[PDB]
Amino acid sequence: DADTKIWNGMVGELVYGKADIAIAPLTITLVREEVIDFSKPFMSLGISI
Amino acid sequence: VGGVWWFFTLIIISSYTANLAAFLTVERMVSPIESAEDLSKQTEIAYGTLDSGSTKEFFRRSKIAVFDKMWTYMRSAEPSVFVRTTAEGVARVRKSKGKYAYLLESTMNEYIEQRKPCDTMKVGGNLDSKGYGIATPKGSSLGTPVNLAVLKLSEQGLLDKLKNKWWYDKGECGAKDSGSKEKTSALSLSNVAGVFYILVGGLGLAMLVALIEFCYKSRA
Amino acid sequence: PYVMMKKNHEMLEGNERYEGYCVDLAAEIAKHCGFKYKLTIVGDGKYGARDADTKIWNGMVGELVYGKADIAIAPLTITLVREEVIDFSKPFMSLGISIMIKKPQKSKPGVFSFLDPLAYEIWMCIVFAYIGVSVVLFLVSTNEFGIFNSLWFSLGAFMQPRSLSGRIVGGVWWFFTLIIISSYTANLAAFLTVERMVSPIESAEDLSKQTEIAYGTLDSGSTKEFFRRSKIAVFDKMWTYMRSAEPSVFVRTTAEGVARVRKSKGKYAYLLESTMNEYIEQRKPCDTMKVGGNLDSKGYGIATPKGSSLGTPVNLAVLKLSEQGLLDKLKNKWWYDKGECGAKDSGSKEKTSALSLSNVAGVFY
Amino acid sequence: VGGVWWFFTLIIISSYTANLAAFLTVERMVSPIESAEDLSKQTEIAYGTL
Ligand SMILES: O=c1[nH]c2cc(C(F)(F)F)c(N3CCOCC3)cc2n(CP(=O)(O)O)c1=O
Ligand SMILES: O=c1[nH]c2cc(C(F)(F)F)c(N3CCOCC3)cc2n(CP(=O)(O)O)c1=O
16 A cells, blocks of 8 residues: 555565465565565466457 | 340359358458457457456556557547456456457466356467465565475476366366367358258159149049 | 677677677666676586586586676576575566477368368268159169169269159259359358468377377477476376387487478477577578467576575566566567567468469369 | 269369459459558568668
């Protein structure tokens, strides 16, 4: 959230110590790589028709 | 009379032949899509994305040639080509008789293709390169271990195996994909069949006139 | 097309000597990380392997571990064996193993170009109804007298008084054949207008289900070792075939493999990295094409010595470049834009026309 | 012989007719450059400036 500058969802629960690890279809984005750590991709994808 | 009638039927059968050819020539002209560039080069088939998400924001910020034009279209397309949820998008594709295409994540798409009534399919390669990963708090102890674990699983083909288990095996369809093989691709017997029934009908009519004729003769 | 020697490289020096995807990717990374660099080609010209005996790393991965270089910007595959000794940034290009076949060419008459317009099923029924009329007429007109007549009605069949019965039979049968020959003519015209030539089917599973078209991989490399170690259903059978296929379905180099596909008239398929494959498709004489999706999920990355300062910076830089679509842009620049071939342009080329003899020949025999 | 020869000529005249239809259909398919966008959509005809 731009205003409150607060992280939500799984990425949030990681930064605020709610969880120890996140195992889900979490996209590896630059904005997230800055606050948390992403392991190598376990599934490559993209936009399809 | 016989000459003019002959010239008359000549024109008609020629017209029938010529006309029947245009319907078959165009029938071949039809070329389903396959790539994203195909969506931009045409307008007959509408298309859109989710009203909110990285998918929509992708085209908006994309400076790539093809994707640019696509966004320009979707940005002012009426009615709204954007849907509220992913379910709405799929429903729009299933109820437009192939007049509406929906752009979404390949992962979720591939899964939908393996769900009843098996009436959806992914076409062409992906538009961009993304990837999911295991997230761990910055400077965690599980960091390095998990990272290597993912690499180990992929090399053992365990990751590919898991996907096959939940995407294709879990199906199911598993049937709609074997019919989508795209085998057939020619003319047909249907039309020609209609002319066969009218033939046998004529033969039967004659077989009736024969007996009937005989009877008449006898009477005489 | 990652790193190549520029045309007039002899008249140039420094980094200006080289050009390619990675050459541009280097400048981009250096711009976002803020540093000057000197492009250098690895000595032995290898990527990154580990000799079992000497336990020594070679190629770029080697020059990193032994302090010869500060960073590796090349199509270096992100493997577990390497991730242990060095650091890999997020993938700047996802790839996998693909299939390469000949150019979807086309050519063949075999009187079978006449039975196609008209389906085999239709040729059959038109023959069944053919004798179906010569038998009905046969009933209109002692054992030999039936043979001479059956041969006469068969001559009245072999196509060209007022017995109303068999009269309407000849008329209806004429109207029947009229429609058919009209359909054949019309349909054949459509064929002569569009004239689209498909091909086989993209799906590694298609290579295993058939044997007519041979296929193989490089005699040495991760590609070959993949099938050997793969426990997946489809890939298993494929390896079983290639493992004992005679003659050898494996080639010495990648060039040999491509040459084998271009000289087998579509009888030999070659399995290789999608990246190199896509590039080949964009090279003269444009007679090769990639079919189906990749067999596995790989990815190249920027390699940096374990515990380096450029580590985190470069990692983020790669992610930034991809999100700005700069990576996709670079690939398009060296693969398709700088390419020479064309597929969507060959289908957009509405032009062609000429009669041969093949089809007509089948009717002569 | 007369029957087979008839079926033979039938196919040929049908082929001639069908093919001749294609030579006129394609003759219409051909389009000439009307604007600049036409120069970009095709490659057969090269073009340049000073
Ligand atoms: O980390 C993320 N991972 C995601 C994974 C998936 C899925 F593919 F379902 F696993 C999806 N969907 C795709 C289809 O529509 C329904 C949900 C959204 C994701 N989003 C939201 P974005 O902002 O639209 O990318 C993320 O943020
Ligand atoms: O790090 C690696 N990066 C590689 C990059 C490429 C290319 F795609 F050309 F860039 C290739 N080729 C693919 C086509 O055949 C010719 C060479 C091999 C690579 N290998 C050897 P592997 O053991 O067979 O994977 C590596 O080890």
